[PDB]
Design a protein around this ligand. Structure first.
Ligand SMILES: Cc1ncc(COP(=O)(O)O)c(/C=N/Cc2ccccn2)c1O
Ligand SMILES: Cc1ncc(COP(=O)(O)O)c(/C=N/Cc2ccccn2)c1O
Ligand SMILES: Cc1ncc(COP(=O)(O)O)c(/C=N/Cc2ccccn2)c1O
Ligand SMILES: Cc1ncc(COP(=O)(O)O)c(/C=N/Cc2ccccn2)c1O
Ligand SMILES: [Ca+2]
Ligand SMILES: [Ca+2]
Ligand SMILES: [Ca+2]
Ligand SMILES: [Ca+2]
Ligand SMILES: [Ca+2]
Ligand SMILES: [Ca+2]
Ligand SMILES: [Ca+2]
Ligand SMILES: [Ca+2]
Lengths: 344, 344, 344, 344
């Protein structure tokens, strides 16, 4: 099977497996795991922030950030197709008692004027707007890179109102590799950033939240409440340090493989826009096929290629360390064989 | 002052004042207030439902309905400009732990195909869609009437998936008067309807939720939790019986006054669409004026007319029993004088 | 029927009925109801506070106070048998996301040393203690009066830790009449007090929260969220002004009737402690009877007397304006006849 | 340092470190991690249950169980000193919207008659009792073993009412070793059991929830919402399998070391009851010392022994794999040297 479903399926490198076996550990509830502590120090340093917090998932990273930024009855502005709204189980309503205010963007970029219009006036009928969340890269639109200028303008709006800014940077190193913007420059326009270790950077488990000391203290207590306060989690942090410090540069290979995949899919005749492919994701539309996305996914699966439908007419293909150029070429031979069987 | 801010400002009639003074009362927590019990009986009968529940506000009516229809973490589909999302203080997230799924409609009518697309499939990442809310009339769009066929098709969609349907019928009698659809007919396509007594029907306080016996018992316990469990509330229900049984027919006068207001505002030169005015509300746009909506609201207030801005470029004018045709004519004179000094 | 179930069953006086009929009203959402505004002014003045808030029930009064005093995850210290824990539908957990810390008291008075021990230290495992609630009079223990020195010492403890203090003063005027302590004096040791109009003071609907300006504005927004934001509620406030200004002194009659009831029940042979009866409630124990409290309640109801069991072995009898000494004498005759057939 | 603070401080065995490095992993969000899957199969088999769910902490295990057993506004009966109430950050109120009903027990055993009395009647004022939680062993009382007969009688009560039963079995294998009761026999009297891998069984991270298939499916979705849905968590489950299958028998050594510690502390002159010591915990009281528990903890820390104060007059000592008999003897020499310096 060639697995193009997600970059979460990456398996740990040999260096990571060794580091996990040899990890120096302690009880993180007492702040005594030295490898967790070093991962958090490195993460804060990398992002230009005072403090950092390891969490067992990107979902938890986002939700403790929302909890630490908000009070009950607040409203959170976020992009209408972003992960926090789409695919985090409604946690923001249950855990934090906040409402989402979905703003449809273009490729993850909310028009700053629409962000302005979404902020609630001080009026007894309205929730209090206390948080704006930005996702970079933006998953649903195809791993698109949100321009730094968009983040800067939204930060400017937030400072005018006293509103917190959170970046869902699950794939912020993919954004950085594609744009040349260092992650600490994105992070300078936010109060908090969540970034994942367990996607393209190939750690088996985890993400990190970075921000100011007082915010991270609140987020750490939120983590305890949600159940993310682990014991000898240095076993995980050992792999996370390798992910953060050694696995960023090679994300360029995933980007090259996704672009090559898209170029050749277009040549075959599929509805793909290679010009849209800036990081490790390709959106393929079924408009010129007689099957819908779900039927094409099943046909691919039966032919040895795993992918996911993100709508009835769109499939998402995701590259990562565990699909090589050889694997991409094999997948393309499978896509080529299938095209005459599914074309309209 | 000529008050076009809202139809909530209606004061009780002399008949209502007499009825409140001599209301037969009892302790509603024990179900022993005879006037509450008769109002609920009349309301259930009027709407063709098994049971009904008096509440002190339309907000509480919507929120106990949401609580009784949902579990924590569920999603509620509703129109993106509907009152439950716009102007109920984020209560659905705080009180029920549910997420709104805002669907932008056309004049309050969500496209049924967009409703279909908004229902979550059963994946672990997604909330469970358990409720669809429809607002009729639709406030923000200008008191617009949602077509019965829209409500009917959404009811069919909901039945398929085992999803509940709630009508926010704050102004459902205005809708009925304008469409000719009996309120019982609207209500047959919903599990619950909230309708207000304290707006155009001129009661001083309250709304009523109608629905099935088991739903209403759940909503009654939700009412107790939220603090709507009153004692000798028959004082209020006495005016409510008069509102429900005697004040519906004259809503036609409010509609005629709103249509007259809109026609004459257009003749003066203001940006109004009299063809959009089907019940008791008029939207005026400030696009051809030197001031925005907030500037115009202040100019109007200084000149003796009260209205509200619903955006930076739109004001909402609402007619009701306590603005006569005389008052509308006087307001139009004020609008005419103001036009030369606000015109662009 | 002779109704000893509760003092909530009080019906409005003729003076109240006239006042409701001619109440001067306005839209309370705009702060424009003159009778609500005067009731809140009188209430704040009576209790020595900056501001006040009318609410439709004592439950809502307590719950908006909790919301305005707390953040999600906080803990609220309160007496283990107090109404907020016992009989407010778990609202503090649902609406505010706070945990109760029940402290068993003696006659409603929590030992201040137990309050000290219940305050959480700052550890990551513990909620933040942000509120202490005191109930005076204390309902479940038999309408008992919490000593002023208890309230004073708990106030000192709370001030030390920056913890808010709420008095559930549903029956604070009963406490004041029995103790000689002015309600303003009780209230000076609390941040907020909720007191009821709809119990012994005989208004048909409502309670009032008093406190600081900023707290009351937070509580007013909480009221909007919960659905207590009414329109022309001056109809209710007119009766409330009469309740607050004219119905306090005669609570002495309720106390005398309760004490007479208890003395005569003991003379008959029932298990009652007349020395415990300081306001308008009597606890009767069924330990020397063939029936339990529920069996005795049914026997009483069949004989024309309404009361409530508060446990399997205890019934609560409550006096109020609508049970005269004549009615108490008639109830005692019924109790005497029943004794020979229920006695053990 | 001799660390008697907790059994959470256990470090992974050499066999665990090897197994983590060699773990066969996959993406647990897709159910594709074979080592997680095998751990869950083994756990369900061991406890006689249909299904099992790995979680990153015991706190998360308890809280997803509460979420899966309850609806908003429910009440949970639990022992007044149990971990869910004492030390889980008020999560049950925030995450599930439920109230605790603390019942003071004797050594973790709630009197079944008190459990009966705590169940709420069906009444509009009351939350719905839907869950009873039992903790075995009971931490705060000194690692005490709850008798099987207590669990059986509480199960009997729950079946009469349709109430769910959850065992907080963080240390259920310690209970089993001490009592001879197999864990699947305890579990047969519960709907769910949470047990920890990361305490005495020496895994670095994690716990497991066991129960019926439908309950575990709900708990798995709760885990996704809280942020416990990890990716290649087979690295952790590899150690967890060794913990579950190889580390249970040697808990007897921890019990022998705790009993030896207690016997010799009593001989030295400290206020310890060796007869109370049935598993791996010892409570030492400071009643006969001139210092309180906090001062004694600091004196111990400065002398090379780590422990924790659980009140102002009580310290808890906890044995585990990483304190040997040699370490216990060294700690006792330190306790002996200190006694003349702190005795009253
Ligand atoms: C932008 C963003 N933010 C947060 C998370 C939550 O991170 P998690 O809780 O899964 O560790 C994710 C997870 N995406 C998983 C996925 C699956 C298939 C294809 C692509 N992506 C995310 O894309
Ligand atoms: C559709 C709808 N649903 C619920 C409510 C809540 O009802 P309340 O809690 O206020 O009783 C309202 C209230 N509209 C008040 C208003 C003010 C100004 C202009 C127009 N309308 C509503 O329009
Ligand atoms: C101390 C206290 N606080 C708040 C409330 C809530 O107030 P409500 O939401 O009902 O307006 C009550 C209500 N007691 C009603 C009752 C019934 C039978 C016998 C005695 N009392 C209360 O005693
Ligand atoms: C009975 C019980 N249940 C759940 C948990 C939560 O498990 P956690 O979320 O920490 O993995 C714990 C944790 N006790 C940690 C501790 C520290 C010091 C001394 C003794 N114990 C527990 O004792
Ligand atoms: Ca900032
Ligand atoms: Ca991975
Ligand atoms: Ca239906
Ligand atoms: Ca009105
Ligand atoms: Ca104060
Ligand atoms: Ca009354
Ligand atoms: Ca069962
Ligand atoms: Ca451990």
């Amino acid at each position: 099977m060639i697995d193009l479903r997600s970059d979460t399926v990456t398996k740990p490198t040999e260096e990571m497996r060794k580091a996990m076996a040899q990890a120096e550990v302690g009880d993180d509830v007492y702040g005594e795991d030295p490898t967790i502590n070093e991962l958090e120090r490195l993460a804060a340093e990398t992002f230009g922030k005072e403090a950092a917090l390891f969490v067992p998932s990107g979902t938890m990273g986002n939700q403790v950030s929302i909890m630490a930024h908000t009070q009950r009855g607040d409203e959170v502005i976020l992009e209408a197709d972003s992960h926090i709204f789409w695919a985090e189980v409604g946690a923001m309503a249950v855990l934090s008692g906040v409402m989402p205010h979905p703003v449809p963007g273009k490729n993850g970029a909310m028009d700053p004027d629409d962000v302005r219009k979404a902020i609630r006036d001080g009026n007894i009928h309205f929730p209090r707007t206390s948080l704006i969340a930005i996702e970079n890269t933006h998953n649903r639109s195809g791993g698109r890179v949100v321009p730094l200028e968009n983040i800067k303008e939204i930060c400017t709006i937030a400072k005018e109102h006293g509103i917190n800014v959170h970046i869902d940077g699950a794939r912020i190193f993919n954004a950085s590799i594609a744009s040349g913007v260092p992650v600490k420059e994105y992070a300078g326009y936010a109060d908090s950033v969540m970034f994942c270790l367990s996607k393209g950077l190939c750690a088996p488990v985890g993400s990190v939240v970075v921000g100011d000391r007082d915010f991270i203290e609140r987020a750490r207590k939120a983590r305890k409440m949600l159940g993310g306060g682990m014991r000898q989690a240095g076993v995980l942090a050992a792999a996370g340090i390798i992910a953060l410090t050694k696995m960023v540069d090679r994300l360029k290979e995933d980007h090259e493989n996704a672009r090559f995949l898209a170029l050749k899919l277009k040549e075959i005749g599929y509805s793909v826009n290679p010009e849209d492919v800036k990081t490790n994701m390709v959106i393929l539309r079924t408009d010129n096929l007689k099957v819908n996305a779900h039927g094409f996914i099943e046909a691919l699966r039966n032919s040895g290629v795993l992918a996911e439908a993100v709508s009835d007419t769109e499939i998402r293909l995701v590259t990562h360390k565990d699909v090589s150029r050889n694997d991409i070429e094999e997948a393309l031979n499978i896509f080529e064989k299938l095209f005459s069987q599914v074309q309209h």
